[PDB]
Enzyme design. Structure first.
Site, short mmCIF file in Angstrom:
data_model
loop_
_atom_site.label_atom_id
_atom_site.label_comp_id
_atom_site.label_asym_id
_atom_site.label_seq_id
_atom_site.Cartn_x
_atom_site.Cartn_y
_atom_site.Cartn_z
N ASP A 249 26.33 15.90 -34.33
CA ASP A 249 27.07 15.06 -34.07
C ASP A 249 27.55 13.87 -35.16
OD1 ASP A 249 29.68 13.35 -33.64
OD2 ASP A 249 29.92 14.12 -31.79
N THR A 250 28.19 13.77 -36.41
CA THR A 250 27.61 12.43 -37.25
C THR A 250 28.29 11.68 -37.08
OG1 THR A 250 29.39 13.94 -39.12
CG2 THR A 250 26.88 14.34 -39.68
N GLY A 251 29.31 11.76 -36.35
CA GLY A 251 30.45 10.71 -35.66
C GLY A 251 30.24 10.41 -35.00
C1 LIG Z 1 39.95 18.10 -30.42
O1 LIG Z 1 39.51 17.20 -31.06
C2 LIG Z 1 39.23 16.19 -30.93
C3 LIG Z 1 38.34 15.06 -31.73
C4 LIG Z 1 37.33 14.09 -31.57
C5 LIG Z 1 36.55 13.97 -30.07
S1 LIG Z 1 35.43 12.81 -29.92
O2 LIG Z 1 36.50 11.00 -31.18
O3 LIG Z 1 36.00 12.65 -28.83
N1 LIG Z 1 34.43 13.21 -30.51
C6 LIG Z 1 33.93 14.56 -29.84
C7 LIG Z 1 32.76 14.51 -29.12
C8 LIG Z 1 32.81 13.83 -28.12
C9 LIG Z 1 32.69 16.18 -28.56
C10 LIG Z 1 33.66 12.64 -31.84
C11 LIG Z 1 32.25 12.40 -31.66
O4 LIG Z 1 31.73 12.45 -32.84
C12 LIG Z 1 32.65 11.16 -31.65
C13 LIG Z 1 33.91 9.93 -32.46
C14 LIG Z 1 33.92 8.89 -32.72
C15 LIG Z 1 33.73 7.39 -33.15
C16 LIG Z 1 33.94 6.50 -33.27
C17 LIG Z 1 34.86 5.89 -31.76
C18 LIG Z 1 35.53 6.40 -31.18
C19 LIG Z 1 35.38 8.22 -31.63
N2 LIG Z 1 31.96 9.83 -31.31
C20 LIG Z 1 31.64 8.83 -30.13
O5 LIG Z 1 31.91 8.96 -28.98
O6 LIG Z 1 30.92 7.89 -30.68
C21 LIG Z 1 30.98 6.89 -30.08
C22 LIG Z 1 30.78 5.28 -30.88
C23 LIG Z 1 30.07 4.26 -30.48
C24 LIG Z 1 28.82 4.52 -29.62
C25 LIG Z 1 28.03 5.76 -30.40
C26 LIG Z 1 28.50 7.00 -29.63
C27 LIG Z 1 27.79 7.71 -28.64
O7 LIG Z 1 27.97 8.32 -27.49
C28 LIG Z 1 29.85 8.22 -27.93
C29 LIG Z 1 30.99 7.51 -26.99
C30 LIG Z 1 29.75 6.85 -28.94
O8 LIG Z 1 29.13 5.14 -27.84
C31 LIG Z 1 37.40 14.52 -29.55
C32 LIG Z 1 38.05 15.90 -29.55
#
Ligand SMILES: COc1ccc(S(=O)(=O)N(CC(C)C)C[C@@H](O)[C@H](Cc2ccccc2)NC(=O)O[C@@H]2CC[C@@H]3C[C@H]4CO[C@@H](C)[C@@]42O3)cc1
Ligand SMILES: [Cl-]
EC number: 3.4.23.16
Lengths: 99, 99
Positions: B25-27
């Site tokens: 997960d690069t995001g």
């Molecule tokens: C059907 O289409 C979709 C499209 C996207 C999503 S999604 O956004 O829900 N998601 C899906 C994963 C969790 C299975 C994509 C993930 O790349 C997310 C992107 C992101 C980054 C930043 C802000 C919001 C979202 N990343 C994140 O959640 O990062 C956060 C960032 C802050 C810290 C570092 C991380 C470790 O834990 C998480 C909770 C984090 O907390 C779901 C369904």
């Protein structure tokens, strides 16, 4: 380009005539853009992440330029804190994860 | 390998003696794994994604093997719908995004 992951992989996108910053996100199935006006019909959808679900508007057949590469597909519009380029558009620009 | 994104980039990880599946997960800045018992003391952390904030437990210096590559670093443990390998460990295995 080759993008290292020391920092968030943010790039410039053009959508609906506006320039925005967005995250290249291999963990996102779909592309999710912050609230804006787009043309066309849309249907409502719920998408789920960490922390729960949000309601978004699903637009189909939207053209997006991603770091200068044109791509077309579905875009979800809603209250996301970050613009997210998901797999549905990363495939169209030929993006791969390499290690 | 080189991983295209037509399907979810799922890999096998091995952590605390158990095989699990996880999303590259690069995001995600950090790595988040479903509830399990890990050794040592933990610290509190709030993480925010698309649907709000959740509290997780932070464990440091955890050994984890990701698709056969050894990494040692910080793992967050909490109620996540999928196990997520974030940039903190993607950089340790030398992953880049290419297009
Ligand atoms: C059907 O289409 C979709 C499209 C996207 C999503 S999604 O956004 O829900 N998601 C899906 C994963 C969790 C299975 C994509 C993930 O790349 C997310 C992107 C992101 C980054 C930043 C802000 C919001 C979202 N990343 C994140 O959640 O990062 C956060 C960032 C802050 C810290 C570092 C991380 C470790 O834990 C998480 C909770 C984090 O907390 C779901 C369904
Ligand atoms: Cl699409």
């Amino acid at each position: 380009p080759q993008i290292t992951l020391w920092k968030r992989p943010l790039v410039t996108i053009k959508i609906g005539g506006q320039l925005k910053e967005a995250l290249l996100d291999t963990g996102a199935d779909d592309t999710v853009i912050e609230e804006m006006s787009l043309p066309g019909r849309w249907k409502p959808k719920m998408i789920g992440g960490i922390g729960g679900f949000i309601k978004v508007r699903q637009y189909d057949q939207i053209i997006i330029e991603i770091a200068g590469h044109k791509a077309i597909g579905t875009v979800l519009v809603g209250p996301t804190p970050v613009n997210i380029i998901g797999r549905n558009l990363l495939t169209q620009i030929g993006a791969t994860l390499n290690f």
